[model samples]
Target: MEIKLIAQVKTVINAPIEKVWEALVNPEIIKEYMFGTTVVSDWKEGSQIVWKGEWKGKAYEDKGTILQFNERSILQYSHFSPLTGKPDLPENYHVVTITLTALKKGVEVELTQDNNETEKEQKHSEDNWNTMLEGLKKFLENKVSA
Candidate 1:
Protein backbone atom coordinates (compact mmCIF):
# COMPACT_ATOMS: atom_id res chain seq x y z
CA MET A 1 0.00 0.00 0.00
CA GLU A 2 2.82 2.38 0.53
CA ILE A 3 4.41 2.53 -2.89
CA LYS A 4 6.95 5.20 -3.57
CA LEU A 5 10.24 5.72 -5.34
CA ILE A 6 12.75 8.33 -4.28
CA ALA A 7 15.99 9.50 -5.80
CA GLN A 8 18.39 11.66 -3.87
CA VAL A 9 21.72 13.18 -4.72
CA LYS A 10 23.97 15.08 -2.34
CA THR A 11 27.14 16.96 -2.89
CA VAL A 12 29.46 19.13 -0.87
CA ILE A 13 29.82 22.46 -2.56
CA ASN A 14 33.05 24.28 -1.98
CA ALA A 15 31.31 27.58 -1.54
CA PRO A 16 29.54 29.63 1.06
CA ILE A 17 25.91 29.19 1.95
CA GLU A 18 25.04 32.53 0.39
CA LYS A 19 26.49 31.50 -2.94
CA VAL A 20 24.68 28.16 -2.88
CA TRP A 21 21.47 29.90 -1.85
CA GLU A 22 21.76 32.22 -4.79
CA ALA A 23 22.36 29.25 -7.06
CA LEU A 24 19.18 27.66 -5.78
CA VAL A 25 16.97 30.71 -6.32
CA ASN A 26 18.63 32.78 -9.02
CA PRO A 27 17.51 31.93 -12.56
CA GLU A 28 20.98 32.38 -14.01
CA ILE A 29 22.63 29.99 -11.58
CA ILE A 30 19.85 27.43 -11.88
CA LYS A 31 20.28 27.32 -15.64
CA GLU A 32 23.82 26.06 -15.22
CA TYR A 33 22.63 22.92 -13.47
CA MET A 34 18.90 22.45 -14.18
CA PHE A 35 19.29 20.92 -17.65
CA GLY A 36 18.08 24.06 -19.40
CA THR A 37 14.95 24.30 -17.28
CA THR A 38 14.52 27.69 -15.67
CA VAL A 39 12.60 27.97 -12.45
CA VAL A 40 10.61 31.16 -12.28
CA SER A 41 8.76 32.14 -9.18
CA ASP A 42 8.57 34.50 -6.25
CA TRP A 43 9.65 31.44 -4.18
CA LYS A 44 7.02 31.82 -1.52
CA GLU A 45 4.81 29.23 0.10
CA GLY A 46 1.48 28.92 -1.73
CA SER A 47 2.91 30.66 -4.78
CA GLN A 48 3.22 29.08 -8.19
CA ILE A 49 6.57 27.76 -9.34
CA VAL A 50 7.20 27.03 -12.97
CA TRP A 51 9.90 25.10 -14.72
CA LYS A 52 9.84 26.28 -18.29
CA GLY A 53 11.93 25.11 -21.19
CA GLU A 54 11.91 23.94 -24.77
CA TRP A 55 12.25 20.36 -25.81
CA LYS A 56 12.84 19.59 -29.47
CA GLY A 57 11.88 23.13 -30.41
CA LYS A 58 8.58 22.88 -28.56
CA ALA A 59 7.89 24.67 -25.34
CA TYR A 60 7.28 22.55 -22.27
CA GLU A 61 6.11 23.71 -18.89
CA ASP A 62 5.97 21.98 -15.57
CA LYS A 63 3.64 23.61 -13.11
CA GLY A 64 4.07 23.41 -9.40
CA THR A 65 2.88 24.93 -6.17
CA ILE A 66 5.41 25.89 -3.61
CA LEU A 67 5.02 24.21 -0.26
CA GLN A 68 8.10 25.42 1.54
CA PHE A 69 10.58 28.15 0.81
CA ASN A 70 13.17 28.55 3.50
CA GLU A 71 16.02 30.54 2.10
CA ARG A 72 19.39 28.77 2.03
CA SER A 73 17.98 25.84 3.94
CA ILE A 74 15.05 24.12 2.20
CA LEU A 75 12.65 24.34 -0.71
CA GLN A 76 9.73 21.96 -1.30
CA TYR A 77 7.32 21.99 -4.20
CA SER A 78 4.55 19.87 -5.65
CA HIS A 79 5.17 19.42 -9.37
CA PHE A 80 2.77 18.35 -12.08
CA SER A 81 3.90 17.47 -15.57
CA PRO A 82 1.31 17.17 -18.25
CA LEU A 83 1.08 13.96 -20.21
CA THR A 84 -0.86 13.14 -23.41
CA GLY A 85 -2.55 16.54 -23.27
CA LYS A 86 -4.37 15.60 -20.11
CA PRO A 87 -3.60 16.53 -16.51
CA ASP A 88 -5.85 14.20 -14.52
CA LEU A 89 -3.28 11.73 -13.26
CA PRO A 90 -1.91 12.09 -9.79
CA GLU A 91 0.77 9.58 -10.72
CA ASN A 92 2.22 12.21 -13.01
CA TYR A 93 2.77 14.52 -10.10
CA HIS A 94 5.58 14.43 -7.57
CA VAL A 95 7.38 16.31 -4.83
CA VAL A 96 10.83 17.78 -5.12
CA THR A 97 12.63 18.86 -2.01
CA ILE A 98 16.03 20.46 -1.83
CA THR A 99 18.05 21.08 1.28
CA LEU A 100 21.21 23.07 1.75
CA THR A 101 23.18 22.67 4.93
CA ALA A 102 26.25 24.55 6.01
CA LEU A 103 29.13 22.20 6.52
CA LYS A 104 32.28 22.83 8.46
CA LYS A 105 34.16 23.69 5.31
CA GLY A 106 31.46 24.52 2.82
CA VAL A 107 27.86 23.75 1.96
CA GLU A 108 25.99 20.50 1.46
CA VAL A 109 23.39 20.41 -1.26
CA GLU A 110 20.78 17.66 -1.26
CA LEU A 111 18.18 17.14 -3.95
CA THR A 112 15.36 14.60 -3.66
CA GLN A 113 12.63 13.68 -6.10
CA ASP A 114 9.87 11.29 -5.09
CA ASN A 115 6.79 9.57 -6.50
CA ASN A 116 8.40 7.78 -9.37
CA GLU A 117 6.03 5.07 -10.57
CA THR A 118 8.35 2.90 -12.62
CA GLU A 119 11.90 1.75 -12.71
CA LYS A 120 12.57 3.77 -15.83
CA GLU A 121 11.22 6.85 -14.13
CA GLN A 122 13.31 6.17 -11.10
CA LYS A 123 16.46 5.70 -13.12
CA HIS A 124 15.86 8.76 -15.24
CA SER A 125 15.31 10.98 -12.24
CA GLU A 126 18.29 9.54 -10.43
CA ASP A 127 20.54 10.25 -13.36
CA ASN A 128 19.24 13.76 -13.80
CA TRP A 129 19.72 14.66 -10.15
CA ASN A 130 23.16 13.13 -10.13
CA THR A 131 24.24 15.09 -13.17
CA MET A 132 22.86 18.36 -11.86
CA LEU A 133 24.44 17.96 -8.47
CA GLU A 134 27.78 17.23 -10.06
CA GLY A 135 27.44 20.24 -12.27
CA LEU A 136 26.65 22.45 -9.29
CA LYS A 137 29.63 21.15 -7.37
CA LYS A 138 31.90 21.74 -10.31
CA PHE A 139 30.58 25.24 -10.86
CA LEU A 140 31.19 26.11 -7.24
CA GLU A 141 34.57 24.42 -6.82
CA ASN A 142 36.00 25.40 -10.19
CA LYS A 143 36.57 28.89 -8.89
CA VAL A 144 39.19 27.68 -6.46
CA SER A 145 40.71 25.30 -8.98
CA ALA A 146 40.96 28.05 -11.52
Candidate 2:
Protein backbone atom coordinates (compact mmCIF):
# COMPACT_ATOMS: atom_id res chain seq x y z
CA MET A 1 0.00 0.00 0.00
CA GLU A 2 1.13 3.52 -0.69
CA ILE A 3 2.19 5.22 2.51
CA LYS A 4 1.41 8.70 1.38
CA LEU A 5 -1.52 10.55 -0.16
CA ILE A 6 -1.29 13.82 -2.05
CA ALA A 7 -3.79 16.64 -2.52
CA GLN A 8 -3.16 19.70 -4.63
CA VAL A 9 -4.94 23.06 -4.90
CA LYS A 10 -4.05 25.92 -7.18
CA THR A 11 -5.16 29.52 -7.43
CA VAL A 12 -4.21 32.74 -9.12
CA ILE A 13 -4.27 35.86 -7.04
CA ASN A 14 -4.76 39.34 -8.42
CA ALA A 15 -1.88 40.71 -6.45
CA PRO A 16 1.85 40.91 -6.94
CA ILE A 17 4.22 38.37 -5.47
CA GLU A 18 5.44 40.70 -2.73
CA LYS A 19 1.95 41.61 -1.61
CA VAL A 20 0.83 38.01 -1.80
CA TRP A 21 3.86 36.99 0.19
CA GLU A 22 3.03 39.52 2.85
CA ALA A 23 -0.53 38.29 3.01
CA LEU A 24 0.78 34.77 3.40
CA VAL A 25 3.29 35.37 6.18
CA ASN A 26 1.57 38.15 8.02
CA PRO A 27 -0.30 37.16 11.16
CA GLU A 28 -3.14 39.60 10.58
CA ILE A 29 -3.93 38.28 7.12
CA ILE A 30 -3.61 34.69 8.26
CA LYS A 31 -6.10 35.27 11.04
CA GLU A 32 -8.60 36.67 8.61
CA TYR A 33 -8.44 33.95 5.98
CA MET A 34 -7.30 30.95 7.99
CA PHE A 35 -10.63 30.42 9.72
CA GLY A 36 -9.61 32.63 12.67
CA THR A 37 -6.54 30.55 13.36
CA THR A 38 -3.17 32.25 13.50
CA VAL A 39 -0.15 30.85 11.64
CA VAL A 40 2.86 31.70 13.70
CA SER A 41 6.24 31.30 12.09
CA ASP A 42 9.48 32.99 11.31
CA TRP A 43 9.30 31.20 7.94
CA LYS A 44 12.90 30.00 8.13
CA GLU A 45 14.04 26.43 7.75
CA GLY A 46 13.80 24.47 11.03
CA SER A 47 11.54 27.11 12.50
CA GLN A 48 8.41 26.23 14.40
CA ILE A 49 5.05 27.01 12.86
CA VAL A 50 1.75 26.39 14.52
CA TRP A 51 -1.96 26.81 13.94
CA LYS A 52 -4.16 27.82 16.81
CA GLY A 53 -7.91 27.67 16.59
CA GLU A 54 -11.05 27.27 18.63
CA TRP A 55 -12.98 24.05 18.51
CA LYS A 56 -16.28 23.68 20.36
CA GLY A 57 -15.49 26.87 22.24
CA LYS A 58 -12.16 25.44 23.32
CA ALA A 59 -8.70 26.14 22.11
CA TYR A 60 -6.94 23.66 19.85
CA GLU A 61 -3.47 23.71 18.39
CA ASP A 62 -1.67 21.90 15.60
CA LYS A 63 2.09 21.94 15.49
CA GLY A 64 4.31 21.92 12.43
CA THR A 65 7.96 22.51 11.73
CA ILE A 66 9.17 24.35 8.72
CA LEU A 67 11.22 22.12 6.46
CA GLN A 68 11.80 24.42 3.55
CA PHE A 69 11.14 28.04 2.72
CA ASN A 70 12.17 30.33 -0.08
CA GLU A 71 10.44 33.62 0.56
CA ARG A 72 7.25 33.67 -1.55
CA SER A 73 8.35 30.96 -3.91
CA ILE A 74 8.16 27.73 -1.90
CA LEU A 75 7.40 26.43 1.55
CA GLN A 76 7.23 22.95 3.06
CA TYR A 77 6.30 21.86 6.54
CA SER A 78 5.40 18.84 8.59
CA HIS A 79 2.04 18.80 10.33
CA PHE A 80 1.30 17.03 13.59
CA SER A 81 -2.22 17.25 14.92
CA PRO A 82 -2.58 16.78 18.59
CA LEU A 83 -4.39 13.65 19.72
CA THR A 84 -7.34 13.88 22.04
CA GLY A 85 -6.24 11.42 24.68
CA LYS A 86 -6.86 8.59 22.26
CA PRO A 87 -4.56 6.25 20.46
CA ASP A 88 -2.48 8.22 18.02
CA LEU A 89 -2.61 7.27 14.38
CA PRO A 90 0.30 7.57 12.00
CA GLU A 91 -1.87 9.16 9.35
CA ASN A 92 -2.47 12.17 11.52
CA TYR A 93 1.05 13.34 10.89
CA HIS A 94 1.71 14.62 7.43
CA VAL A 95 3.66 17.04 5.27
CA VAL A 96 2.18 20.07 3.55
CA THR A 97 4.07 21.80 0.79
CA ILE A 98 3.11 25.12 -0.76
CA THR A 99 4.61 26.60 -3.89
CA LEU A 100 3.99 30.12 -5.13
CA THR A 101 4.95 31.00 -8.65
CA ALA A 102 4.83 34.52 -9.95
CA LEU A 103 2.88 35.14 -13.13
CA LYS A 104 2.83 38.09 -15.45
CA LYS A 105 -0.29 39.57 -13.89
CA GLY A 106 -0.43 37.82 -10.54
CA VAL A 107 0.74 34.79 -8.61
CA GLU A 108 0.06 31.07 -8.81
CA VAL A 109 -0.20 29.17 -5.56
CA GLU A 110 -0.18 25.40 -5.20
CA LEU A 111 -0.75 23.54 -1.96
CA THR A 112 -0.13 19.85 -1.49
CA GLN A 113 -0.74 17.83 1.62
CA ASP A 114 0.78 14.37 1.85
CA ASN A 115 -0.24 11.69 4.29
CA ASN A 116 -0.58 7.99 4.79
CA GLU A 117 -4.27 7.48 4.29
CA THR A 118 -7.06 6.28 2.02
CA GLU A 119 -8.29 7.87 -1.17
CA LYS A 120 -11.33 9.24 0.63
CA GLU A 121 -9.09 11.15 3.00
CA GLN A 122 -7.09 12.49 0.09
CA LYS A 123 -10.20 13.71 -1.71
CA HIS A 124 -11.55 15.26 1.44
CA SER A 125 -8.28 17.09 1.95
CA GLU A 126 -8.29 18.31 -1.64
CA ASP A 127 -11.73 19.80 -1.11
CA ASN A 128 -10.66 21.44 2.10
CA TRP A 129 -7.53 22.89 0.50
CA ASN A 130 -9.55 24.20 -2.41
CA THR A 131 -11.83 26.10 -0.07
CA MET A 132 -8.91 27.48 1.91
CA LEU A 133 -7.08 28.65 -1.19
CA GLU A 134 -10.22 30.34 -2.45
CA GLY A 135 -10.54 32.07 0.86
CA LEU A 136 -6.91 33.18 0.64
CA LYS A 137 -7.28 34.54 -2.87
CA LYS A 138 -10.44 36.42 -1.99
CA PHE A 139 -8.93 37.89 1.12
CA LEU A 140 -5.71 39.00 -0.56
CA GLU A 141 -7.30 40.45 -3.65
CA ASN A 142 -10.00 42.31 -1.75
CA LYS A 143 -8.15 43.36 1.36
CA VAL A 144 -4.68 44.07 0.04
CA SER A 145 -3.90 46.45 -2.78
CA ALA A 146 -0.69 47.36 -4.53
Candidate 3:
Protein backbone atom coordinates (compact mmCIF):
# COMPACT_ATOMS: atom_id res chain seq x y z
CA MET A 1 0.00 0.00 0.00
CA GLU A 2 1.20 3.49 -0.80
CA ILE A 3 0.85 6.20 1.81
CA LYS A 4 0.43 9.76 0.71
CA LEU A 5 0.56 12.77 3.02
CA ILE A 6 -0.26 16.43 3.05
CA ALA A 7 1.78 19.04 4.88
CA GLN A 8 -0.25 21.81 6.47
CA VAL A 9 0.58 24.93 8.43
CA LYS A 10 -1.60 27.68 9.83
CA THR A 11 -0.85 31.10 11.24
CA VAL A 12 -2.52 34.38 12.05
CA ILE A 13 -1.07 37.59 10.67
CA ASN A 14 -1.89 40.85 12.33
CA ALA A 15 -2.73 42.45 9.05
CA PRO A 16 -5.66 42.65 6.72
CA ILE A 17 -6.37 39.99 4.17
CA GLU A 18 -5.45 42.37 1.40
CA LYS A 19 -1.95 42.89 2.73
CA VAL A 20 -1.55 39.19 3.21
CA TRP A 21 -2.57 38.59 -0.34
CA GLU A 22 -0.11 41.16 -1.59
CA ALA A 23 2.71 39.59 0.32
CA LEU A 24 1.84 36.27 -1.23
CA VAL A 25 2.00 37.51 -4.80
CA ASN A 26 4.32 40.47 -4.73
CA PRO A 27 7.76 39.36 -5.98
CA GLU A 28 9.80 41.65 -3.76
CA ILE A 29 7.80 40.69 -0.71
CA ILE A 30 8.03 37.04 -1.69
CA LYS A 31 11.79 37.25 -1.82
CA GLU A 32 11.89 38.46 1.75
CA TYR A 33 9.66 35.70 3.02
CA MET A 34 10.64 32.94 0.65
CA PHE A 35 14.38 32.82 1.28
CA GLY A 36 15.46 35.45 -1.23
CA THR A 37 13.92 33.82 -4.28
CA THR A 38 12.53 36.03 -7.01
CA VAL A 39 9.16 35.01 -8.45
CA VAL A 40 8.02 36.01 -11.91
CA SER A 41 4.55 35.45 -13.30
CA ASP A 42 1.45 37.06 -14.70
CA TRP A 43 -0.52 35.47 -11.84
CA LYS A 44 -3.43 34.66 -14.09
CA GLU A 45 -5.18 31.33 -13.89
CA GLY A 46 -3.28 28.66 -15.85
CA SER A 47 -0.32 30.97 -16.32
CA GLN A 48 3.19 29.90 -15.51
CA ILE A 49 5.04 31.15 -12.40
CA VAL A 50 8.72 30.71 -11.90
CA TRP A 51 11.15 31.12 -9.04
CA LYS A 52 14.87 31.76 -9.40
CA GLY A 53 17.41 31.94 -6.62
CA GLU A 54 20.54 30.61 -5.06
CA TRP A 55 20.28 28.32 -2.09
CA LYS A 56 23.65 27.89 -0.37
CA GLY A 57 25.39 29.09 -3.52
CA LYS A 58 23.56 26.55 -5.69
CA ALA A 59 21.44 28.21 -8.35
CA TYR A 60 18.03 26.75 -8.98
CA GLU A 61 14.91 27.50 -10.89
CA ASP A 62 11.58 26.20 -9.70
CA LYS A 63 8.42 26.58 -11.70
CA GLY A 64 4.74 25.80 -11.87
CA THR A 65 1.40 26.87 -13.27
CA ILE A 66 -1.24 28.77 -11.39
CA LEU A 67 -4.20 26.54 -10.62
CA GLN A 68 -6.30 29.09 -8.74
CA PHE A 69 -5.98 32.76 -7.96
CA ASN A 70 -8.88 34.22 -6.03
CA GLU A 71 -8.16 37.74 -4.88
CA ARG A 72 -7.31 37.99 -1.19
CA SER A 73 -8.74 34.59 -0.43
CA ILE A 74 -7.14 31.66 -2.21
CA LEU A 75 -4.03 30.89 -4.25
CA GLN A 76 -3.11 27.47 -5.49
CA TYR A 77 -0.26 26.29 -7.71
CA SER A 78 1.83 23.31 -8.64
CA HIS A 79 5.56 23.47 -7.88
CA PHE A 80 8.50 21.44 -9.12
CA SER A 81 12.11 21.85 -8.00
CA PRO A 82 15.06 20.33 -9.76
CA LEU A 83 16.86 20.26 -6.43
CA THR A 84 14.66 17.37 -5.54
CA GLY A 85 16.67 15.44 -8.14
CA LYS A 86 13.42 13.86 -9.25
CA PRO A 87 12.47 13.74 -12.89
CA ASP A 88 10.33 16.60 -14.05
CA LEU A 89 7.24 14.40 -14.17
CA PRO A 90 3.70 15.13 -13.11
CA GLU A 91 4.04 12.73 -10.21
CA ASN A 92 7.02 14.68 -8.89
CA TYR A 93 5.14 17.93 -8.67
CA HIS A 94 3.35 19.11 -5.57
CA VAL A 95 0.23 21.19 -5.28
CA VAL A 96 0.28 24.03 -2.80
CA THR A 97 -2.81 25.86 -1.63
CA ILE A 98 -2.95 28.93 0.55
CA THR A 99 -6.14 30.32 1.99
CA LEU A 100 -6.85 33.47 3.93
CA THR A 101 -9.77 34.17 6.24
CA ALA A 102 -10.46 37.58 7.68
CA LEU A 103 -10.93 37.66 11.42
CA LYS A 104 -11.86 40.58 13.57
CA LYS A 105 -8.30 41.07 14.73
CA GLY A 106 -6.23 39.54 11.97
CA VAL A 107 -6.19 37.33 8.93
CA GLU A 108 -5.94 33.61 9.41
CA VAL A 109 -3.60 31.99 6.93
CA GLU A 110 -3.53 28.31 6.16
CA LEU A 111 -1.17 26.58 3.75
CA THR A 112 -1.11 23.00 2.58
CA GLN A 113 1.18 21.06 0.29
CA ASP A 114 0.00 17.78 -1.14
CA ASN A 115 1.86 14.66 -2.35
CA ASN A 116 4.36 14.12 0.40
CA GLU A 117 5.45 10.53 0.35
CA THR A 118 6.10 9.94 4.03
CA GLU A 119 6.12 11.48 7.48
CA LYS A 120 9.65 12.78 7.05
CA GLU A 121 8.84 14.44 3.76
CA GLN A 122 5.64 15.90 5.21
CA LYS A 123 7.49 17.31 8.19
CA HIS A 124 10.14 18.84 5.96
CA SER A 125 7.54 20.67 3.95
CA GLU A 126 5.71 21.76 7.08
CA ASP A 127 8.88 23.22 8.52
CA ASN A 128 9.64 25.16 5.36
CA TRP A 129 6.09 26.48 5.12
CA ASN A 130 6.06 27.50 8.76
CA THR A 131 9.29 29.44 8.30
CA MET A 132 7.90 31.33 5.34
CA LEU A 133 4.56 31.96 7.09
CA GLU A 134 6.32 33.39 10.11
CA GLY A 135 8.40 35.60 7.86
CA LEU A 136 5.28 36.84 6.10
CA LYS A 137 3.61 37.62 9.41
CA LYS A 138 6.57 39.56 10.70
CA PHE A 139 7.09 41.56 7.54
CA LEU A 140 3.47 42.66 7.28
CA GLU A 141 2.90 43.31 10.96
CA ASN A 142 6.04 45.40 11.21
CA LYS A 143 5.13 47.38 8.16
CA VAL A 144 1.71 48.05 9.61
CA SER A 145 3.19 49.41 12.82
CA ALA A 146 5.83 51.53 11.16
Candidate 4:
Protein backbone atom coordinates (compact mmCIF):
# COMPACT_ATOMS: atom_id res chain seq x y z
CA MET A 1 0.00 0.00 0.00
CA GLU A 2 1.20 3.46 -0.81
CA ILE A 3 0.61 6.46 1.41
CA LYS A 4 -0.16 9.81 -0.11
CA LEU A 5 2.08 12.59 1.14
CA ILE A 6 1.87 15.42 -1.36
CA ALA A 7 -0.85 17.74 -2.57
CA GLN A 8 -0.50 19.21 -6.04
CA VAL A 9 -2.39 21.83 -8.04
CA LYS A 10 -1.85 23.13 -11.54
CA THR A 11 -3.38 26.14 -13.22
CA VAL A 12 -3.06 27.86 -16.57
CA ILE A 13 -3.21 31.61 -16.50
CA ASN A 14 -3.50 33.96 -19.45
CA ALA A 15 -0.29 35.77 -18.75
CA PRO A 16 3.38 35.44 -19.41
CA ILE A 17 5.92 33.98 -17.01
CA GLU A 18 7.01 37.42 -15.85
CA LYS A 19 3.48 38.42 -15.02
CA VAL A 20 2.75 35.10 -13.40
CA TRP A 21 5.88 35.29 -11.33
CA GLU A 22 5.04 38.78 -10.22
CA ALA A 23 1.58 37.65 -9.23
CA LEU A 24 3.10 34.87 -7.17
CA VAL A 25 5.85 36.78 -5.39
CA ASN A 26 4.78 40.36 -5.27
CA PRO A 27 3.25 40.82 -1.83
CA GLU A 28 1.13 43.73 -2.97
CA ILE A 29 -0.37 41.78 -5.86
CA ILE A 30 -0.49 38.52 -3.95
CA LYS A 31 -3.03 40.10 -1.62
CA GLU A 32 -5.49 40.16 -4.47
CA TYR A 33 -5.26 36.43 -5.18
CA MET A 34 -3.44 34.53 -2.46
CA PHE A 35 -6.38 33.81 -0.22
CA GLY A 36 -6.74 37.58 0.17
CA THR A 37 -3.89 37.63 2.63
CA THR A 38 -0.89 39.95 2.70
CA VAL A 39 2.40 38.14 2.19
CA VAL A 40 5.65 39.51 3.56
CA SER A 41 9.00 38.29 2.39
CA ASP A 42 12.45 39.47 1.48
CA TRP A 43 12.23 36.92 -1.38
CA LYS A 44 15.84 35.85 -1.00
CA GLU A 45 16.76 32.26 -0.36
CA GLY A 46 16.77 31.47 3.38
CA SER A 47 14.82 34.62 4.16
CA GLN A 48 11.73 34.54 6.33
CA ILE A 49 8.30 34.69 4.78
CA VAL A 50 4.95 35.28 6.38
CA TRP A 51 1.34 35.36 5.28
CA LYS A 52 -0.94 37.19 7.64
CA GLY A 53 -4.50 38.38 7.49
CA GLU A 54 -8.00 37.78 8.72
CA TRP A 55 -9.36 34.24 8.43
CA LYS A 56 -12.69 33.07 9.79
CA GLY A 57 -13.10 36.49 11.36
CA LYS A 58 -9.80 36.15 13.16
CA ALA A 59 -6.29 37.31 12.53
CA TYR A 60 -4.11 34.47 11.39
CA GLU A 61 -0.48 34.18 10.42
CA ASP A 62 1.75 31.46 9.05
CA LYS A 63 5.53 31.72 8.85
CA GLY A 64 8.01 30.10 6.55
CA THR A 65 11.56 30.21 5.31
CA ILE A 66 12.53 30.49 1.68
CA LEU A 67 14.34 27.37 0.55
CA GLN A 68 14.83 28.13 -3.09
CA PHE A 69 13.99 31.08 -5.30
CA ASN A 70 14.53 31.34 -9.01
CA GLU A 71 13.14 34.64 -10.16
CA ARG A 72 10.18 34.21 -12.51
CA SER A 73 10.58 30.46 -12.65
CA ILE A 74 10.35 28.61 -9.33
CA LEU A 75 10.05 29.09 -5.60
CA GLN A 76 10.33 26.63 -2.73
CA TYR A 77 9.84 27.31 0.93
CA SER A 78 9.53 25.55 4.25
CA HIS A 79 6.23 26.35 5.92
CA PHE A 80 5.80 26.46 9.67
CA SER A 81 2.94 27.00 12.05
CA PRO A 82 3.08 30.01 14.36
CA LEU A 83 1.52 28.02 17.15
CA THR A 84 4.72 25.99 17.45
CA GLY A 85 6.84 29.01 18.36
CA LYS A 86 9.66 27.53 16.31
CA PRO A 87 9.73 24.18 18.02
CA ASP A 88 11.79 21.27 16.81
CA LEU A 89 9.38 18.63 15.64
CA PRO A 90 9.21 16.26 12.71
CA GLU A 91 5.71 17.39 11.82
CA ASN A 92 6.30 21.09 12.35
CA TYR A 93 7.76 21.77 8.96
CA HIS A 94 6.66 21.16 5.39
CA VAL A 95 7.84 22.37 2.02
CA VAL A 96 5.78 24.21 -0.58
CA THR A 97 6.89 24.65 -4.17
CA ILE A 98 5.45 26.73 -6.97
CA THR A 99 6.77 26.68 -10.51
CA LEU A 100 5.81 28.49 -13.65
CA THR A 101 6.08 27.12 -17.18
CA ALA A 102 5.79 29.42 -20.12
CA LEU A 103 3.16 28.50 -22.65
CA LYS A 104 1.92 29.69 -26.00
CA LYS A 105 -0.95 31.64 -24.54
CA GLY A 106 0.25 32.20 -21.03
CA VAL A 107 1.86 30.26 -18.22
CA GLU A 108 1.26 27.03 -16.32
CA VAL A 109 1.61 27.20 -12.57
CA GLU A 110 2.37 24.06 -10.62
CA LEU A 111 2.02 23.92 -6.87
CA THR A 112 3.14 21.13 -4.60
CA GLN A 113 2.85 20.86 -0.85
CA ASP A 114 3.71 18.04 1.46
CA ASN A 115 0.55 16.56 2.96
CA ASN A 116 1.40 16.12 6.60
CA GLU A 117 -2.03 16.51 8.04
CA THR A 118 -5.13 14.39 8.53
CA GLU A 119 -7.12 13.12 5.56
CA LYS A 120 -9.58 15.96 5.63
CA GLU A 121 -6.84 18.51 6.07
CA GLN A 122 -5.00 17.15 3.06
CA LYS A 123 -8.01 17.63 0.83
CA HIS A 124 -8.79 21.00 2.30
CA SER A 125 -5.24 22.13 1.73
CA GLU A 126 -5.33 21.26 -1.95
CA ASP A 127 -8.74 22.78 -2.36
CA ASN A 128 -7.50 26.03 -0.90
CA TRP A 129 -4.52 26.06 -3.22
CA ASN A 130 -6.65 25.38 -6.26
CA THR A 131 -9.01 28.16 -5.32
CA MET A 132 -6.15 30.61 -4.96
CA LEU A 133 -4.73 29.61 -8.31
CA GLU A 134 -8.10 30.19 -9.90
CA GLY A 135 -8.22 33.60 -8.29
CA LEU A 136 -4.77 34.32 -9.70
CA LYS A 137 -5.93 33.38 -13.18
CA LYS A 138 -8.93 35.62 -12.89
CA PHE A 139 -6.95 38.49 -11.50
CA LEU A 140 -4.40 38.31 -14.24
CA GLU A 141 -7.00 38.09 -16.96
CA ASN A 142 -9.09 40.97 -15.74
CA LYS A 143 -6.84 43.33 -13.82
CA VAL A 144 -3.40 43.15 -15.36
CA SER A 145 -2.79 45.61 -18.18
CA ALA A 146 -1.43 44.26 -21.42
**Candidate 1 vs. true structure, TM-score:** 0.81
**How does each model score on TM-score?**
0.81, 0.79, 0.83, 0.76
For 22-125, candidate 3 gives per-residue lDDT tens digits of 76777776666555676787867898988777878988788788888787678888877788786656787778888888989877889988888789989998
Off by over 4 Å in 4: 1-4, 33-38, 52-61, 83-90, 143-146
Predicted structure with the largest TM-score when compared to the true one: 3
Alpha-carbon local distance difference test for all models: 0.76, 0.74, 0.79, 0.74
The 10-residue segment with the lowest total lDDT in model 2:
83-92
Query: Which regions of candidate 1 deviate over 4 angstroms?
Result: 32-39, 83-87
Q: Residue 76 lDDT in model 3?
A: 89
Ranking by TM-score: 3, 1, 2, 4
Candidate 3 vs 4: which has more TM-score: 3
* lDDT assessment of candidate 3: 0.79
In the range 1-146, model 1's lDDT, one tens digit per residue, is: 78687877776667788877877767677776666776777757888877777767988787778788886678787877763466576776678888878888977778888877777988998998897777666677788876
TM-score of 2: 0.79
Q: Kindly state the number of residue pairs that clash in model 4.
A: 0
Q: Please report how far candidate 2 places residue 29 from its true position, in Å.
A: 1.4
lDDT of 2 by residue, 1-146 (tens): 55576777787666777877776667776676555676777768899877777878978887778788787688777878774444767565778787878888877788877763678988898888887777776665665565
Q: Taking the tens digit of each residue's C-alpha lDDT, what string does model 4 give over 34-118?
A: 5567678887889888777775686778877888888777788887776655567757667788888887877777988884467
